[PDB]
Design a protein around this ligand. Structure first.
Ligand SMILES: Nc1nc2c(ncn2[C@@H]2O[C@H](COP(=O)(O)OP(=O)(O)O)[C@@H](O)[C@H]2O)c(=O)[nH]1
Ligand SMILES: [Mg+2]
Length: 184
């Protein structure tokens, strides 16, 4: 008896350092295409249809960025948010350090009781030889899975998930978990 069931409307906001793949993740989820050439700064106004656990959900995808108008305006995205995707890049230890230093304080300031899914994107670079050589110059290496899980535990995230927007692996699962968190 599923036809004629009213949809549940939820709002998702995605935040994180520039270039970690926030917009690419939204486009892969929304359009099943990894944007290869002309990716905008933000992917705005989209509302995704997603069914999880027999509930039909309309999930508004709010993209954010970090420069000029986007930085001063970003706090305007937070009202009435039902779930947060907080993204770092596995090829960027610095983007992980900003999770506790910047993103968690900001999100806890504007969205105090909203569930946070911590997302490690670009997991395809974990074994990319060029990535390893560039990070090795800095005595660094790609973020390890246990390092992401540990950060998720520290910030009290609803969960930790790893993605490659590029291969699309894990992307669907992130938004499904985020929809469940939103239904709380
Ligand atoms: N290898 C790889 N590159 C990615 C991935 N996700 C995004 N990118 C690239 O990372 C850069 C930033 O992407 P964008 O989606 O613009 O990041 P945003 O600034 O967080 O919105 C672009 O060059 C994307 O093609 C991923 O999973 N793997
Ligand atoms: Mg973007």
């Amino acid at each position: 008896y599923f036809q004629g069931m009213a949809a549940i409307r939820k709002k998702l906001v995605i935040v994180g350092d520039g270039a970690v793949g926030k917009t690419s993740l939204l486009i892969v989820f929304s359009k099943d295409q990894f944007p290869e050439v002309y990716v905008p700064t933000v992917f705005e106004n989209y509302v995704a249809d997603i069914e999880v656990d027999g509930k039909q959900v309309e999930l508004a995808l709010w993209d954010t960025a970090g420069q000029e108008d986007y930085d001063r305006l970003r706090p305007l995205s937070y009202p009435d948010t039902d779930v947060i995707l907080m993204v770092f890049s596995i090829d960027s230890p610095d983007s992980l350090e900003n999770i506790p230093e910047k993103w968690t304080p900001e999100v806890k300031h504007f969205c105090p009781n909203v569930p946070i899914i911590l997302v490690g994107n670009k997991k395809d670079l974990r074994n990319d030889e060029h990535t390893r050589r560039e990070l090795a110059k800095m005595k660094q290496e790609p973020v390890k899975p246990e390092e992401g899980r540990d950060m998720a535990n520290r910030i009290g995230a609803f969960g930790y998930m790893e993605t490659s927007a590029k291969t699309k692996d894990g992307v669907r699962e992130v938004f499904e978990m985020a929809t469940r968190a939103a239904l709380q």
